[PDB]
Amino acid sequence: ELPAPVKAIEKQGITIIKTFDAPGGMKGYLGKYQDMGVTIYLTPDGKHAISGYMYNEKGENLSNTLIEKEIYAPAGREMWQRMEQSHWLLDGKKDAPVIVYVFADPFCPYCEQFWQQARPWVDSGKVQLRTLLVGVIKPESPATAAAILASKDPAKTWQQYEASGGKLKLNVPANVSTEQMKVLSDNEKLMDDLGANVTPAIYYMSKENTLQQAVGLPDQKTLNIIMGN
Amino acid sequence: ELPAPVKAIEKQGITIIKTFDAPGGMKGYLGKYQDMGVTIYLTPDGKHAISGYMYNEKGENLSNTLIEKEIYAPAGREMWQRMEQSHWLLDGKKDAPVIVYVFADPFCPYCEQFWQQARPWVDSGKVQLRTLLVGVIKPESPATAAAILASKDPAKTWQQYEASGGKLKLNVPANVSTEQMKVLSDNEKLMDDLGANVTPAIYYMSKENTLQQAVGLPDQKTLNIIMGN
Numbered sequence: 172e173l174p175a176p177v178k179a180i181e182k183q184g185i186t187i188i189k190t191f192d193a194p195g196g197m198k199g200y201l202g203k204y205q206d207m208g209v210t211i212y213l214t215p216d217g218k219h220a221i222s223g224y225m226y227n228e229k230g231e232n233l234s235n236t237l238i239e240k241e242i243y244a245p246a247g248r249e250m251w252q253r254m255e256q257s258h259w260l261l262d263g264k265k266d267a268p269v270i271v272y273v274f275a276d277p278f279c280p281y282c283e284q285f286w287q288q289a290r291p292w293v294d295s296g297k298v299q300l301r302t303l304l305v306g307v308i309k310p311e312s313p314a315t316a317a318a319i320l321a322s323k324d325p326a327k328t329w330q331q332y333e334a335s336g337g338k339l340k341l342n343v344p345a346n347v348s349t350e351q352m353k354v355l356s357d358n359e360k361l362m363d364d365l366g367a368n369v370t371p372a373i374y375y376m377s378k379e380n381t382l383q384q385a386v387g388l389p390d391q392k393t394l395n396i397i398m399g400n
Numbered sequence: 401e402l403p404a405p406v407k408a409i410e411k412q413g414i415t416i417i418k419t420f421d422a423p424g425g426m427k428g429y430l431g432k433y434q435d436m437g438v439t440i441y442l443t444p445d446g447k448h449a450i451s452g453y454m455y456n457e458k459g460e461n462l463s464n465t466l467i468e469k470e471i472y473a474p475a476g477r478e479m480w481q482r483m484e485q486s487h488w489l490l491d492g493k494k495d496a497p498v499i500v501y502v503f504a505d506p507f508c509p510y511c512e513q514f515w516q517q518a519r520p521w522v523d524s525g526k527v528q529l530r531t532l533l534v535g536v537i538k539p540e541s542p543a544t545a546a547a548i549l550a551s552k553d554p555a556k557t558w559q560q561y562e563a564s565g566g567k568l569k570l571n572v573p574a575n576v577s578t579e580q581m582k583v584l585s586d587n588e589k590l591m592d593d594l595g596a597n598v599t600p601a602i603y604y605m606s607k608e609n610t611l612q613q614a615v616g617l618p619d620q621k622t623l624n625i626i627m628g629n
Contacts, residue, residue, distance in 0.1 A: 179459030195444035214454075215424035215444050219462070223452015225443075230408030233448070 176220035180211055185222070187211075191237070193225070201241060208238035239379045247382025253361055254374060258354045259301035260326040262286075267299035269399040274362040274372040276308040277315040277337060281388040282371040286333035288389070292398040302329060303358040305370065317351040318343055373397060405449035409440055414451070416440075420466070422454070430470060437467035468608045476611025482590055483603060487583045488530035489555040491515075496528035498628040503591040503601040505537040506544040506566060510617040511600040515562035517618070521627040531558060532587040534599065546580040547572055602626060 173181070177200055181187065185202045193199035193212050200211040200220075212221045224234040254272045269292070275282035292298040304320065306313030318341045322328040332339045347355070362372055365384065373385040375397050385393050402410070406429055410416065414431045422428035422441050429440040429449075441450045453463040483501045498521070504511035521527040533549065535542030547570045551557040561568045576584070591601055594613065602614040604626050614622050 175457040175459075176455050179455045179457075182459065194448050195446075197443065212450055214426065217424075218457050219423050219454050221441055221450050221452045221454045223450045225448050225450045226405050226408045228404040228408075228447050230404075230411065 174213055174217060174220065176218060177211055177213060180220060180222050183222075185209060185211070188242075201237065203242075208242040210234040210237060236379070239381055243381040244379070250361075250365060250374075251376070251382055253364075254301070254303065257303050257358060257361060258320075259303050260329050261299060261301060262326065262330055263293040263299035264296040265299065267293075267296055269298040270301060270376070271298055271397055272301045272303060272374040274303050274305055274358065274365075274367075274370055274374075276305055276312050276370045277319065277332065278309040278312055279370045280336075283333050283336050284388050285371050285373070285394075286330075288394055289398065292400070298398055303361070304329075304355065305359045305362055306355050307359060307368075308370065313347060313355060314343070315341070316355055317347040320351045320354060321348065375399075403442055403446060403449065405447060406440055406442060409449060409451050412451075414438060414440070417471075430466065432471075437471040439463040439466060465608070468610055472610040473608070479590075479594060479603075480605070480611055482593075483530070483532065486532050486587060486590060487549075488532050489558050490528060490530060491555065491559055492522040492528035493525040494528065496522075496525055498527040499530060499605070500527055500626055501530045501532060501603040503532050503534055503587065503594075503596075503599055503603075505534055505541050505599045506548065506561065507538040507541055508599045509565075512562050512565050513617050514600050514602070514623075515559075517623055518627065521629070527627055532590070533558075533584065534588045534591055535584050536588060536597075537599065542576060542584060543572070544570070545584055546576040549580045549583060550577065604628075 173187075183204075185204050187200050187202040189201050191199040191201055196215045198213040200213070202209050202211060209222060210225065212223075212225065214220065224232055226232055259272065271289075273282070273285070286300070289298065289300060293300060304316040306316040319325055319328050319332060321344050322342065328339075328341070332341075362368070365372060365374065367384060367386045369386050371387070373389065375383050375385075377383050385397055389397060402416075412433075414433050416429050416431040418430050420428040420430055425444045427442040429442070431438050431440060438451060439454065441452075441454065443449065453461055455461055488501065500518075502511070502514070515529070518527065518529060522529060533545040535545040548554055548557050548561060550573050551571065557568075557570070561570075591597070594601060594603065596613060596615045598615050600616070602618065604612050604614075606612050607628075614626055618626060
């Protein structure tokens with residue numbers, strides 16, 4: 172059974188997930204208090220346990236690294252894949268190291284403003300924006316989004332559309348094609364699954380490889396983080 | 401110099417107070433982050449350190465015990481002594497295990513209400529209230545407080561005074577004696593030193609032997625704690 176010291180910490184409202192190997196002959200226990208991940212370390216004397224964060228000589232918070240890798244990283248791994256497998260439009264270099272997904276609607280001022288804010292990083296080749304269009308804000312959103320998808324170079328058309336603040340004139344098709352309709356519907360369901368119905372809904376990966384979200388127009392700090400700066 | 405792992409934690413905004421002996425061949429470091437006490441433990445491998453709370457087999461939070469004994473207990477040790485050395489009035493058994501000091505004014509509804517709330521514990525002999533009178537609320541507060549001190553049995557008179565909701569009739573002396581004036585002035589300065597100018601200002605010791613304060617009429621939980629329940 173569980174060592175007495177660890178059982179004492181459980182009584183403090185902690186639920187253990189699993190054990191793991193720790194340095195110095197110490198045994199580790201990964202757990203959670205509410206929605207917060209925690210690490211517990213059984214001492215060498217075996218009669219004590221420490222609930223806290225372990226750091227190494229290089230100054231790395233190993234407990235944080237573990238909690239993010241084992242508890243947070245897995246959370247949005249599938250979501251990231253679903254976005255990657257969707258019909259997104261490329262804005263920037265195909266080999267840009269930083270990938271950012273954005274669910275956007277044609278009639279969305281903040282989508283346009285975010286597009287402008289990102290220019291420095293996209294143009295430098297550091298970041299690539301992958302846009303998943305949706306048609307949910309205005310009556311004409313579906314048709315306009317489909318019209319963009321229907322153009323000769325959808326990615327370029329979207330870029331011009333955002334740059335113009337949504338004023339760019341478009342060739343309006345007689346109807347939304349079944350493929351365009353599928354893309355829009357599939358994208359809206361994924362957006363819904365991600366939990367944010369407001370556009371722009373921006374998704375990115377932290378330096379620790381965990382899925383992050385930003386809804387609306389990012390402030391300066393959030394923008395810099397989304398851009399991997 | 402300080403081990404690398406510990407130096408890393410210092411960079412996280414911690415200032416070390418001193419080192420201490422920890423179990424399992426671990427070295428302990430007592431510090432503070434802002435006004436918060438923290439304990440750091442250097443691992444046996446010496447290449448890691450854990451910032452957190454250590455628990456023993458009996459479930460005692462040793463880090464909390466240490467932080468309170470070394471950081472908090474000393475804080476009000478002198479204040480407690482100054483109260484004990486003042487001219488307080490006894491309400492309850494001289495040998496009551498729980499001692500509670502109260503700075504009170506004669507014209508104070510909440511002082512009276514707190515007096516009533518404490519009856520169960522005082523009458524059972526568990527708690528003794530030691531009142532340090534002050535005359536700061538009303539123009540007549542000084543004279544009334546002195547009149548109580550001037551009575552045949554000051555402690556009994558105060559008890560009757562509080563029980564009556566401040567209606568008890570008193571023999572009013574021609575003036576405040578120099579001794580009464582000294583008691584009132586000394587008590588007001590100590591009260592001022594404690595940081596609370598509002599009466600009642602209640603002082604007590606926690607189960608961990610640290611000085612606690614309650615200002616105004618305690619709610620049910622605070623009352624139970626003051627009474628050592």
